Amino acid sequence: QGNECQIDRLTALEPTNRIQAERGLTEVWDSNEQEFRCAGVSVIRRTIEPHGLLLPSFTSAPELIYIEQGNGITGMMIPGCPETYQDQHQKIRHLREGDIFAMPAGVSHWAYNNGDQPLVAVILIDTANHANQLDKNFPTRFYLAGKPQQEHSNTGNIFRGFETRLLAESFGVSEEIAQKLQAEQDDRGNIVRVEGLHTICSARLAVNVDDPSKADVYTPEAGRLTTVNSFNLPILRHLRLSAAKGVLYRNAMMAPHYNLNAHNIMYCVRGRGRIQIVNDQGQSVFDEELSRGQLVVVPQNFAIVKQAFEDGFEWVSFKTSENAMFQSLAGRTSAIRSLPIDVVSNIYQISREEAFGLKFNRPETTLFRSSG
Amino acid sequence: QGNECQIDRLTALEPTNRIQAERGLTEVWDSNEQEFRCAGVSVIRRTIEPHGLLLPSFTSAPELIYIEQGNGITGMMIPGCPETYQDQHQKIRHLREGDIFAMPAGVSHWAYNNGDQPLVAVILIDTANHANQLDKNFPTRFYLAGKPQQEHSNTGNIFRGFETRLLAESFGVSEEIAQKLQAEQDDRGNIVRVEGLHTICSARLAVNVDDPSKADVYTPEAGRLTTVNSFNLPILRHLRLSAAKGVLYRNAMMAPHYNLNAHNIMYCVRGRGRIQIVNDQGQSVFDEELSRGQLVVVPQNFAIVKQAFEDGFEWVSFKTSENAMFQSLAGRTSAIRSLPIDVVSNIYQISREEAFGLKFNRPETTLFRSSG
């Protein structure tokens, strides 16, 4: 078939499946939605209650994680990295709100909310990544403990699969304890309640996009845009993903722009925006308001404008390539302004002075203060 | 299915659709042709009349452009590149005959023929490029002005898609002028008549293959071969495409060879040649004469020989990978000559002296002077 990107209708998408576990919630968007198929990604949102432990798992696809809310810690068990010092374990890293974290394909990991508010992560799973060599339709997830529900469609964690004897032998451990590995008798789900706890090897593997000094774009009382790519997060050189966080203040807008190289899974973090998206046909495929917890998939090259309402509008964009670049159509550093004025007047059939105003009437860069 | 490269018949291909615009012509080859599906490319040829302005557009796929005829200028609006100095615009670059230009995915651009003869560009659109994340069947093109016809299959340029108000607001411009953006009232097509006009940021993004000093191969009264790859055109490191131009003089031939790594879209620029192509089965899939404006798709690894006729034969080869490499079967630096003579005689069941002549009777490299 291969026509999933012939899109004339996009939708504000919300999770269509829930997975309730003892200490957390996993909400799964519908990966069958055409625009997800086009983008080749899946999105989940996990809400881990305080003292909740997301059991160790891995997925064949790389993930881009935004910590929407809360703080906690994630342990990554990267093969080959140094033990640490009783007890030994690999580097524990901290998760905080505003954090954009990169999970390389196959890397096993667990998370724990050691904070007071629920820990909330919005996870892009890039099933179409070159790194994912399993199926492209749905993420494949392998758990290392518990008896977790399938997240994307007689089952258990990978240990349940092995002959119990082999397990016991493997760990130099009793059979009875091996059965604990297999968690055949476990009903807690993928996020369990705990009490308390207590170069890739050394990098943070994250950058906090709430750090206003890191913004690439600010416009006085318009807002800011903060990019995560291969320069501030070098691992993204390997994942070939990037990300951005945007804040639009009351009635501010992001000029119509298109992303050159990447699909943009724009998740609304807070506020509300009139979002309009146009396809290659010059047809609007989207003209709706996005608010908390909704996302829209902006396909590569699809033109888009974001107009904040009175409460502003804030989003994280997961981008399906390395150093995704976009181009504003209006403003300073825009397609129009890059056009020689004669080209502008000629292509739009307007005066050299109408052209001028078309080019320069908008002095802001990318983010504008607007009236609502 | 995935059998589009099971090819037993190739065809001399010509455009199957025309798109007439006010100041230019766009001829589109049939991307459904099996060998195009196999190669994962589309080909167009644009003829821009003098004083003709190819409206700004972009496509999700990278393009390799050969300027077959004429000269003019192209403006590339690469996001982030410096303005220039009344008026400000991005770097204007010159296009001349023999130019092989690389357009990265998503980069918006316009062209203008400021010369006296029609400006003619043969464009390979590499829809199967990793850079293209939309559909693979047909190029997706987005225009920034006018009301252009679909080039590959109630429509308009991307601005037509937006709420007019939002447009006006975006540019700090009147509504009436915003409607000009949307060009709902435009009948000029994608190439309009104009009057006159007047690290990637600084590179030429082109090399002229008509520069005889750049030839990698010359053979006295046989002709020349000139390659564009990542060394003389570094951007091609990003596009993962390469190109070559070949000139065969009267009755000269390019020895049977195969390309190791890439499909070869060989477009005939001038002259005429008996071209023969063999598949993995040892079957001829092509044995016809190519002339002006026709192309054949040579699939990766398919063996091919090109025999010029009395007027010679000249072609541009667009190659679907980085630094595509080929191997001659005959001549100096050929498969046969690289074979130890005993291997040759043994595999061909011939004498050590028949073998010798098989190896050395052909002292030329790649291009030979032949009799017609």
Add this chain to the structure above:
Amino acid sequence: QGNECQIDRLTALEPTNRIQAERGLTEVWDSNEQEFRCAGVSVIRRTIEPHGLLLPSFTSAPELIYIEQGNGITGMMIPGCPETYQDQHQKIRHLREGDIFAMPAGVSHWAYNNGDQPLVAVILIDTANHANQLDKNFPTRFYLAGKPQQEHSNTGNIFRGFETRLLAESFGVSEEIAQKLQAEQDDRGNIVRVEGLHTICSARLAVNVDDPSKADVYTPEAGRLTTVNSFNLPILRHLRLSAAKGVLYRNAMMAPHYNLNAHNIMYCVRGRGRIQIVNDQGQSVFDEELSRGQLVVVPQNFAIVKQAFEDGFEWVSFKTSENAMFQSLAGRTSAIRSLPIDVVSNIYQISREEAFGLKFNRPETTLFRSSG
């Protein structure tokens, strides 16, 4: 469809087609097998009798070759590499048992057994490699001599395809000899009997994994693991494949582990092992004994344990990515040991001391001495 990696059953796979030639045998596994489709590879094994010459050929896919048995020499005709000094030919390289050799896509090559025992190579053909731009279902092979049978499904070597005249002309050779090229009158098949014979340009393009000093893992009376990746075989940076050889001594085991980034085509070289493989569902998809000449496909991220029997168990793993990395679940440098003990006890619902033993009772790295 795209569900070939939804695997609940793997099989010990053996060749399903034989191709007998005059001086050798070619055994072809069934590339239609679901797990081959999932992995996107094909496997062949060629047995070249002493004094046997594997005719020159190339395939659009890169190959990883393990010399299971024997020694001989392979000639690679890489385009552009220096002639050598009567006779001139390209660098001849030696093949020996334990050799893991990398063949880049499209590179023409022949092999010859100049040894006394049959020369046996197990060949992974990575049809799903980015380098292969032809069909993905089956390897495409082009021969440069003889009249070889199709290896994967009115035919001949590529020369047979050309007009004989053109051939003769091409090589400056008589017609009668040109017909020898076309081998229309040849019944020897792809491996013929001979008598005797006699930066990529200069690299060995191989590393011998039988070199015990190169082992990355040894465990006293357990065995060893030896990896071939981009560091000891730099060309693999281009192929994006890796390999390993494993030897398990009597009753030794490789702890349950999963490969993070790559499918693992594990071919059994000698001995016998109880191999168990688990999918993402916690279901065993394989629990059988592998022995000489059988392979199983371990999909990326599928968990696996290998238990040698009394004769030990030795395998070569062809891996479908660059520097494939795996993670042991048990032992030193394992997922479990990388887990903070509180996470372990909490996720497995066991004591801080049961947890401890789960973590540390297994002091070996990856390879363990076990009881059978």
